[PDB]
Design a protein around this ligand. Structure first.
Ligand SMILES: *[C@H](C)[C@H]1/C(=C/c2[nH]c(/C=C3N=C(/C=C4\NC(=O)C(CC)=C4C)C(C)=C\3CCC(=O)O)c(CCC(=O)O)c2C)NC(=O)[C@@H]1C
Ligand SMILES: *[C@H](C)[C@H]1/C(=C/c2[nH]c(/C=C3N=C(/C=C4\NC(=O)C(CC)=C4C)C(C)=C\3CCC(=O)O)c(CCC(=O)O)c2C)NC(=O)[C@@H]1C
Ligand SMILES: *[C@H](C)[C@H]1/C(=C/c2[nH]c(/C=C3N=C(/C=C4\NC(=O)C(CC)=C4C)C(C)=C\3CCC(=O)O)c(CCC(=O)O)c2C)NC(=O)[C@@H]1C
Ligand SMILES: *[C@H](C)[C@H]1/C(=C/c2[nH]c(/C=C3N=C(/C=C4\NC(=O)C(CC)=C4C)C(C)=C\3CCC(=O)O)c(CCC(=O)O)c2C)NC(=O)[C@@H]1C
Ligand SMILES: *[C@H](C)[C@H]1/C(=C/c2[nH]c(/C=C3N=C(/C=C4\NC(=O)C(CC)=C4C)C(C)=C\3CCC(=O)O)c(CCC(=O)O)c2C)NC(=O)[C@@H]1C
Ligand SMILES: *[C@H](C)[C@H]1/C(=C/c2[nH]c(/C=C3N=C(/C=C4\NC(=O)C(CC)=C4C)C(C)=C\3CCC(=O)O)c(CCC(=O)O)c2C)NC(=O)[C@@H]1C
Ligand SMILES: *[C@H](C)[C@H]1/C(=C/c2[nH]c(/C=C3N=C(/C=C4\NC(=O)C(CC)=C4C)C(C)=C\3CCC(=O)O)c(CCC(=O)O)c2C)NC(=O)[C@@H]1C
Ligand SMILES: *[C@H](C)[C@H]1/C(=C/c2[nH]c(/C=C3N=C(/C=C4\NC(=O)C(CC)=C4C)C(C)=C\3CCC(=O)O)c(CCC(=O)O)c2C)NC(=O)[C@@H]1C
Ligand SMILES: *[C@H](C)[C@H]1/C(=C/c2[nH]c(/C=C3N=C(/C=C4\NC(=O)C(CC)=C4C)C(C)=C\3CCC(=O)O)c(CCC(=O)O)c2C)NC(=O)[C@@H]1C
Lengths: 67, 160, 161, 218, 160, 161, 161, 160, 160, 161
C-alpha cells in the first residue's frame, strides 16, 4: 500500500488544556494513501498546519501493484 | 458571521449551502446596516460609556480602588478602565459580526485563568461589564438596546 | 476560516482599534455584494457537476494526461481528478461567499502542493483545468461574480503553481 | 431488543431470536434518539453539554489511557517509558477486543510501529479493529446490525443513538464492507472530539439496562 | 496477481503462507501455459472481438448511437470501441494474472464516476463486455472459453 | 526518564557488575541531599501559582507582548502562556527532585521548538519569562535549592535556545 | 508491491500495450521458476524458527553483543533482535516467492536504516546475522533457491547498510 | 527508583507530588542505609547464593541438567548459573532502588520470548530465583529477609 | 480511599496490585490513628469551627448577609452555615479516606451549576471554606493542620 | 465500587452525619485488618498461576469436561476457561483488599449468569473450580486470610448458581 508520512502542527482553540498535549500538537505519522484525503480534510478543518507530505512507501506513476 | 458558520456546517457534509442557509445569509446581509448603526453608536460613545460604568463600579465595589485592592492607584485604575474599553470593543465586534464568536475568540477563552493569575476578582469584572451594559442601554432604543444586550449579557455570562 | 467581516475585525483588533471609517466602508461593501454572492453560490450549486464535466473535456480529455503514461489513464486517477476539481469548485464557492480566500488557505492549500509533488500529478495540467473551470463558471454565473470566482480560483492556482 | 448486547467487560452476547424467544419489536422512526447515561458527571452528557465531549469523567467514569508520556527512543537500559506505552498497548487490546488476546495473536508490527512514533493511537486501534481476528470474533458470527452495534460500543464508547448512525454504518456495510465500516466509525467527527490521536477509547455511556445490571445488585 | 494477494493476505496475519495458498500458486504456475494461450488468442483476435461485440451491442442498444447518446456518431463510436478494446486489454491482463486485481487497479476502481462525468451509461458498457464474452466464448475451446468467462463475468458484475 | 539512583544502576548494569563501593557512595550522595530536594519541591508546590504570577508580572506584562499584536494579546494567548510557564515550573520541580534532567528532555523539549516556530511563540520573551521564574523560585526556596532549580530552568532555556 | 507478473503488466499498461513477445517471455521465465519458488517457500515456512535460532546461535550468541554493553543485552533487546530476524526471513521469503523486491521496500525498508541509526542497533551485526540466516536457508533448500534467498536478503542488508 | 516512579505517577495526573508521596520518599531516603547494607549482604555473598541455589534447583528440577534438558553438560550448567547471577544482580538493583521497575525493564520484558528462542523452561527459571530467595533469606534477619523477599517474589511472579 | 484508587488502577490494567500500591496501602492503614484523630478533632469542635468561620465570612463579605444578599435574613444565614457544616463534614470524610474522592463526588461535581442556580456567589463559598480552614488549623498541631489543609485546599480550589 | 472506608462514609453521608464512635470503630477494625489483607494479596499475586493450575487439576482435568464433547475441550475453550478463573481470582483478591464485595457485582457478576447460559458454559463445574481455588488459596495463605478470600470467592459462586 502507498503510505504517506505527514507532518502537521495542530493548534488548540476553544480550550486551555493542562495535561500534556505536545504529542498531539506537532506530530509526524504514517498515513495509508486511501485515508489521506479524509485525514487532510480533518487536520485542516480542525485548524492544523500540515507542514510536510511525502510518499514514504510506494512509487508515482504506478498503474498496477499498489496494494 | 452566519456566513462562516453556514460554510463550516456545509463543509461538514462536503455540500453546498442549501436555499434556507443562503436566505439566512441574505437576511443577515440586509440587517448589516442596522447592525452597523448600533456598532457606530457604541463606538462613538465609547468614552462616556466606559467612564460612567467605571464610576458606577467604583461605588458598588469601593474596596477595589482603596489601598490593598487590585485596581488601586492611577496606573491600576487606568488598566481597569482599559480592560472595560477592551471588552466594549469586543462587544462592537460582536454586534457588527452578528455573533459572539469574536468576543469568545479574543476575550473569553481563558479569562478566568488570566484574571486569577492577575488576582482580579472576576465577579467585579462581570459587574463592570454589567454597568457598561446599563450605560450603553441608556443610549439606545429598545430594539438596539436588546441587540447590544445580547452580546453584553454573553460577556457577563462568560465573565463569571 | 474568516469572512471579510471577520477579516476586518481582526485587522482592527491586531491594532487594538475600534472599527474606523475605512472598516465600516469595507463592511458596507461586503453587505452590498452579499446579494450577488448568494445568487452566484446558488447558481453554482445546480451546475457544479455540469461545470466539471465541461471543463475537463475542454482542458484534459484527449491529451497525454489521460492516455497510457499520463497521470489520468487509470479510472482511479480519472475519478480522483474529478474529485479534486469538484472540491475546487465547491471551495472556491465557499471563498466567494465569504469574500475572503482564508478558507482556500486552510482547507485547500494546507499541504496540497507537497501532496501533488509526491504523486507526480502535473501542476501545469491541474492549473490549466482550474482555469478551464473558471472560464466555464463565467458563462453560467455572469460577469462580476465571474470575476469574483476567477479571483478565488486564480488564488488557488497561485497556491499550487 | 435482540440487537442490544450485554454491557459486560468482554464478549458480544446478544439474545438469540429463536432461543427462548423474547423479541420486543417497537416502532422507532428514522429520527428517534436513544437516551444514554453518561459514565461520569451527569452534566457532562454531550446532549446537554455538547462541548463536554472528551471531558474525562474522573472518578465517576472509566479509567482513560493516554499516550501522554514520550515514547521510548523518540541507548541505555532502565528507560521508564517502556511500562506506560506497554500498559497503553494492552489497554487498547482490552478496549477493542474486551480482553487480552492469547499468545501469538497480538498485532506485533502495529505495536512496534506505534512504539516507534510512526503511527498514532488512533491508527493503532484502527489496525486492531480491522484485524482478521476482530473480523472473526466480532463481525463474522453476528447479524450485520448486531456486529455494527457492538463495534460502535467498542470504538465510540457508546451505543448508537438511533436510525441515523445505524443506517449510515449499515449502508456502508452494504456497499463497501467491514473495513469501510470500521473506517467510518474511527474517522467520524465524534471519535476525534471524544478521543484524539493519543487516547485509547473507553466506555463513555450506558443504556439504562446496562447501568441497572451493574448497579441494582444487592 | 494471485501470488501478490496471497502474500498480502498472509502478511496481514503475519504468517509464512498456508498450504492452500502455495498449492494454488503451484497450480497457477503450471497452468500458465493455458492461461497464456487464452491471452494470446484474445490479443491476436482483439480487433474482431471488439467489432462483433460493438455491432451486437448497438443492435442491443441502438440509443447510444442515436443523437444524444454518449457514443453518437463515428468519432464517439470510435471512442466507445476504444473503451471496449481497453477493457479487452484488461481481460487479457487479468487472465494471465490469475486474479482480478489489475482490472480493478486500472479500469474498475472509479469507472462509475468516470462514466457519470462523461454521461456514458455504464450498464451499456456492461452489455458491451457481455457481447465480447459471447463472441470470445466461441472462438476458443470449451474450457478456455470458461476460463476467460470468469474474468468477463467479473467485469460485467463490477460494471452492473 | 532518569534520576541519580537510576543513573548509578544504569552505569553498573551497562558495565555488568554488582553495585560497588563507589556506586554506593554516589547513591549516598543523592540520599543525603534528599531532605532539601523534598522540602524545595513541597514549598514550590505550595507556591507555584504565585511564582508564575510574579514571574509574568516582572517579565511580560506591560510590553508589546501583552499589547495588541503581541503573542500574549488575546485571552487565549495569555492563558496558554501561563499554562506553559506552569509546565516549566512543575517539570523543573520534577527534575530537581530526581537530580537528572532526563525528564526535561523526554516530556518538555521533544519537539517544543518546532511547535513554537509553527505557532509563532517567541523564544526571547519565553526565555526571559523562564529566567524570571528562576529568580522568583530562587528567592522563595533558598540558596542551594534555588541553584538546583536554576540549573534545570537553564536546561529548559538552552533547549529552547 | 509488484510481482514479476504485475511488473510486466505495469510496464505494458504504462506503455499501453497488450502482452508483447518480451512480456510473454518474461512471464514464461517466471512460470518456469515458480516451482522451485514454491518449494523453497514451503521449506522455509516449515522450519523458519529453527533457521533464525541456529543463525543467532552461530553468529550472535556468547559474544560482546549479548554481553553487558552490547546492543542485544537485556531480555527486551534480545526479543527485539530475534523478531527483527524473523521478520527479515518472512519478508525475504515473500520476496523470493514473487520474483521481485518491491515488497522489501514497501514493508521492511520503510525507514528502517534511519530507525536503527536513531536507536543505535548496529548496522554490521544485523548484516552478519542475516548472512547466517541466508547460509542456513541455502543449506536447507538448495543452491538456486538459496541463491535467490541470498540475493533478496542481501537486498535487505544493502537497504540497511 | 521510588522517586522516578512517584514522578511518573504525579505527571500521569498533571500535578505535583502529593505530601504522601513526598513523605514516602523521605522515609525511603532516611532508611537508605538499611537497604544500602542489604544490597551489600547480597553482593558480597553472591557466589554462595548462586551456587547453593543452583545445587538446590538441580535437586528440584533434575530434568534440565539431564541429557535433552536445556542445561545438560557443564557448559550449559555454567551458563544457567550465569543467568542466576544476573538475576540476583537485578534483585540487588531492586532492593537498592526501592522499585521493581529496573528489574522489570532489564530482566523481565520479553524474557519469555528470549527463553522461548533459547528453549529454556521458564517455571525452572522461576524456581532458580525462588531458591536464590530462600538461600539469601537464610543469610539475614527476618525483617531484612521480608524486605528482600518483596523483590525476589516480584521476579518469581513475572516468570511463572 | 487510597485502597479504592489502587484497586481501580489495577482493575483497569487487568493486573494484581503492584508492590508499590500494596506498600502505599500499608502506609495508609498503619497511619490510620492520625487520620482518625484529625477527624475526631474536626467533628468534636464542628460547631465552634462553623460559628467562628461564619462570623469571619460575614464580617469580610457583609454584602452576602445584608439586604439584597443571598444569605440575608435569619433563614438564609442559617442555610449558609448549614452549607459550611456540610463542607466541614465532607472534609472529615476526605481526611479519614486519605483521598479527596468522597468530597469531590458529594459536593464539588456540578457545584458551580447548583450555586449559580441558587444565585449564591461561589467566590464567597470558597472564602467561607477558607475561613473554616483557618479556624480548624488553629485547633490542632501543625502536623494535623498540614494534613487537613490539603483537603480544605482541594475544596477551595474547586470553587475558585 | 466502595471499600470498607467508603461504605462507612456512604452510610454516614446518607444520614448526613459526622462519623460517630461506631463508624470510627469500623474504620479502626478495617485498618487493623489492612496488614493481613495486604500480605494475603501479595501471596495471591505471587502464586496466581499456580493457584489456578492446582484448582483446575483438582476439579476439572481428567473428566468429561476436558474430553471431546465437554465445554473445556479444544485449546481455545481451555484458554478461555482458565482465563475466567484468573479473572475470578483477581476480582476476589480485589474484594478482599477492599473488604467489600461491591466490585464483584459492578464488574463481574453483572450479566455473568446470562453470559454463561447463552454460551452453554456449565455453571456447576465453574463453581467447583472456584471452590477448588478457594481451598488452594486457603492452604497457601492461611486460615484467616483464607477465610476472607473464601467469603469473596463464595460471593462469586453465589452470583453464578
Ligand atoms: C462504449 C461501450 C460506451 C461509451 C464510451 C465512451 N467513452 C468515452 C470517453 C472516455 N472513456 C475513457 C476510458 C477509460 N478510462 C480509463 O481509465 C480506462 C480504463 C483502462 C478506460 C477504458 C476515457 C479516458 C474517456 C475520456 C476521453 C479520452 O480518453 O480523452 C466516450 C466519449 C465521451 C464524450 O462525449 O467525450 C465514449 C463515447 N459510450 C457509450 O455510450 C457506450 C456505452
Ligand atoms: C486533476 C485536475 C489532475 C490530477 C489529480 C490527481 N490527484 C491525485 C491525488 C490526490 N489529490 C488529492 C486532493 C486534494 N488534496 C488537498 O489538500 C485538496 C483540498 C481539498 C484536494 C482536492 C489528494 C489528497 C491526493 C492523494 C490522496 C488521495 O487521492 O486520497 C491523483 C492520484 C495520484 C496517484 O494515484 O498516485 C490524481 C490523478 N491528475 C491529473 O493528471 C490532473 C491534471
Ligand atoms: C429533577 C427535577 C429530578 C432529578 C433529576 C436527575 N436526573 C439525573 C440524571 C439524568 N437525567 C437524565 C435525563 C435525560 N437525558 C436526556 O437526554 C433526556 C432527554 C432530553 C433526559 C430527560 C439522564 C439521561 C441522566 C443520567 C446522567 C446523564 O445526564 O447522562 C440525576 C442524577 C442521578 C444520579 O444518581 O446521578 C438527577 C438527580 N432528581 C430528582 O430527585 C428530581 C425530582
Ligand atoms: C477593571 C474592571 C478590573 C481590573 C482590571 C485590571 N486588569 C489588569 C491587568 C490586565 N488586564 C488584562 C486583560 C486583557 N488584555 C487583553 O489583551 C484583553 C483582551 C482584548 C484583555 C481582557 C491583561 C492582559 C493584564 C495584564 C497587564 C498588562 O496588560 O500588561 C490590572 C492590573 C493588575 C496588576 O496588578 O498589574 C487591572 C487593575 N481590576 C479590577 O479590580 C477590576 C474588577
Ligand atoms: C509564555 C511565556 C509565552 C507564550 C506561550 C504560548 N504557548 C502557546 C502554545 C503552546 N505551548 C505549548 C507548549 C507545551 N505543551 C505541552 O504539553 C508542553 C510539554 C509538557 C509544552 C512545553 C504547546 C504544545 C502549544 C500548542 C498547543 C496548546 O497550546 O494546547 C501559545 C500559542 C497560542 C495559540 O493558540 O496560538 C502561546 C501564546 N507566548 C508568548 O508570547 C510568551 C513569551
Ligand atoms: C538483531 C539482529 C539486532 C538488533 C535489533 C534491534 N532492533 C530494535 C528496534 C527496532 N527494530 C525495528 C524493526 C523493524 N522496522 C521495520 O519497519 C521492520 C519491518 C517490519 C522491522 C523488522 C523497529 C521498528 C525498532 C524500533 C521500535 C521497536 O521497539 O520495535 C532493537 C531495540 C533497541 C532498544 O530497545 O533500544 C533491537 C535490539 N540489535 C542488535 O544488537 C542486533 C544486531
Ligand atoms: C538457568 C536458571 C536455566 C537455563 C538457562 C539458560 N539460559 C541460556 C542462555 C541465555 N540466557 C540469556 C539470558 C539473559 N541475558 C541477558 O542479558 C538477560 C538480562 C540480565 C537475560 C535474562 C541469554 C541472552 C542467553 C544466550 C547466551 C548468552 O548469554 O550469550 C542457556 C544456554 C542455552 C544454549 O543453547 O546455550 C541456558 C541453559 N536453562 C535451564 O534449564 C534453567 C532452568
Ligand atoms: C506429549 C507430546 C507431551 C506432553 C503431554 C501432556 N499433556 C498433558 C495434559 C493435557 N493435554 C491436554 C491437551 C489438549 N486438550 C485439547 O482439547 C487439545 C486439542 C484437542 C489439546 C492438545 C489437556 C487438556 C491436558 C489436561 C488433562 C486432560 O486431558 O484432562 C499431560 C499431563 C499433565 C499433568 O500434569 O497431568 C502431558 C504429559 N507432555 C510432555 O512432556 C510432552 C512434550
Ligand atoms: C472454566 C472454569 C469454565 C469454562 C469457561 C469458559 N468461558 C468461556 C467464554 C467466555 N467467558 C466469558 C466471561 C466473562 N466476560 C466478562 O466480561 C466477565 C467478567 C470480566 C466474565 C467472567 C465470556 C464473555 C465468554 C465469551 C467470550 C470469550 O470467550 O472471549 C468459554 C469458551 C466458550 C466459547 O467457545 O465461546 C469457556 C470454555 N468452561 C468450562 O467448562 C469450565 C467449567
Amino acid at each position: 500500500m502507498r503510505m504517506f508520512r505527514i507532518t502537521a502542527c495542530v493548534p488548540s482553540q476553544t480550550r486551555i488544556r493542562t495535561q500534556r498535549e505536545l504529542q498531539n500538537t506537532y506530530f509526524t505519522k504514517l498515513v495509508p494513501y486511501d485515508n489521506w484525503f479524509r485525514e487532510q480534510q480533518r487536520i485542516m478543518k480542525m485548524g492544523g498546519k500540515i507542514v510536510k507530505v511525502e510518499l514514504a512507501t510506494g512509487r508515482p506513476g504506478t498503474n498496477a501493484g499498489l496494494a | 458571521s452566519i456566513v462562516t458558520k453556514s460554510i463550516v456546517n456545509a463543509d461538514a457534509e462536503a455540500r453546498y449551502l442549501s436555499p434556507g442557509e443562503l436566505d439566512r445569509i441574505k437576511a443577515f446581509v440586509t440587517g448589516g446596516a442596522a447592525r452597523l448603526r448600533i456598532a457606530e453608536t457604541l463606538t462613538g460613545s465609547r468614552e462616556t460609556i466606559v467612564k460612567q460604568a467605571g464610576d458606577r463600579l467604583f461605588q458598588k465595589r469601593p474596596d477595589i480602588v482603596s489601598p490593598g485592592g487590585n485596581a488601586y492607584g492611577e496606573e491600576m485604575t487606568a488598566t481597569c478602565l482599559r480592560d472595560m474599553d477592551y471588552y466594549l470593543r469586543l462587544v462592537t465586534y460582536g454586534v457588527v459580526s452578528g455573533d459572539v464568536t469574536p468576543i469568545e475568540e479574543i476575550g473569553l477563552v481563558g479569562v478566568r485563568e488570566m484574571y486569577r493569575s492577575l488576582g482580579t476578582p472576576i465577579e467585579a469584572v462581570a459587574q463592570s461589564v454589567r454597568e457598561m451594559k446599563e450605560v450603553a442601554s441608556g443610549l439606545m432604543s429598545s430594539d438596539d438596546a436588546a441587540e447590544a444586550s445580547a452580546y453584553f449579557d454573553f460577556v457577563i455570562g462568560k465573565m463569571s | 476560516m474568516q469572512d471579510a467581516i471577520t477579516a476586518v475585525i481582526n485587522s482592527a483588533d491586531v491594532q487594538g482599534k475600534y472599527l474606523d471609517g475605512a472598516a465600516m466602508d469595507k463592511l458596507k461593501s461586503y453587505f452590498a455584494s452579499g446579494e450577488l454572492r448568494v445568487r452566484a453560490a446558488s447558481v453554482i450549486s445546480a451546475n457544479a457537476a455540469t461545470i466539471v464535466k465541461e471543463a475537463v473535456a475542454k482542458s484534459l480529455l484527449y491529451s497525454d494526461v489521460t492516455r497510457p503514461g499520463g497521470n489520468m489513464y487509470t479510472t482511479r486517477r480519472y475519478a480522483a481528478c474529478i474529485r479534486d476539481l469538484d472540491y475546487y469548485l465547491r471551495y472556491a464557492t465557499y471563498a466567494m461567499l465569504a469574500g475572503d480566500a482564508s478558507i482556500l488557505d486552510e482547507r485547500v492549500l494546507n499541504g496540497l502542493k507537497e501532496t501533488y509533488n509526491s504523486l507526480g500529478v502535473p501542476i501545469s495540467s491541474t492549473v490549466q483545468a482550474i482555469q478551464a473551470i473558471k472560464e466555464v463558471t463565467a458563462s453560467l454565473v455572469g460577469a462580476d461574480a465571474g470575476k469574483e470566482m476567477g479571483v478565488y480560483l486564480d488564488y488557488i492556482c497561485s497556491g499550487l503553481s | 431488543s435482540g440487537n442490544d448486547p450485554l454491557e459486560i467487560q468482554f464478549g458480544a452476547i446478544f439474545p438469540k431470536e429463536t432461543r427462548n424467544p423474547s423479541k420486543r419489536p417497537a416502532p422507532f422512526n428514522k429520527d428517534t434518539k436513544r437516551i444514554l447515561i453518561h459514565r461520569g458527571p451527569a452534566v457532562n452528557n454531550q446532549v446537554g453539554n455538547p462541548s463536554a465531549v472528551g471531558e474525562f469523567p474522573g472518578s465517576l467514569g472509566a479509567k482513560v489511557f493516554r499516550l501522554n508520556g514520550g515514547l521510548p527512543g523518540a541507548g541505555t537500559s532502565v528507560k521508564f517509558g517502556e511500562s506506560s506505552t506497554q500498559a497503553l498497548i494492552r489497554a487498547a487490546y482490552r478496549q477493542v477486543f474486551g480482553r487480552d488476546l492469547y499468545e501469538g495473536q497480538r498485532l506485533s508490527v502495529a505495536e512496534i510501529q506505534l512504539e516507534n512514533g510512526d503511527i498514532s493511537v488512533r491508527e493503532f486501534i484502527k489496525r486492531l479493529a480491522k484485524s482478521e481476528l476482530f473480523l472473526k470474533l466480532y463481525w463474522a458470527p453476528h447479524y450485520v446490525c448486531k456486529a455494527i452495534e457492538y463495534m460502535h460500543r467498542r470504538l465510540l464508547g457508546r451505543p448508537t443513538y438511533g436510525r441515523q448512525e445505524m443506517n449510515q454504518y449499515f449502508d456502508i456495510a452494504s456497499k463497501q464492507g467491514f473495513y469501510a465500516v470500521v473506517e467510518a466509525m474511527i474517522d467520524s467527527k465524534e471519535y476525534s472530539d471524544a478521543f484524539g490521536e493519543d487516547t485509547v477509547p473507553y466506555e463513555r455511556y450506558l443504556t439504562p439496562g446496562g447501568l441497572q445490571m451493574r448497579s441494582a445488585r444487592v
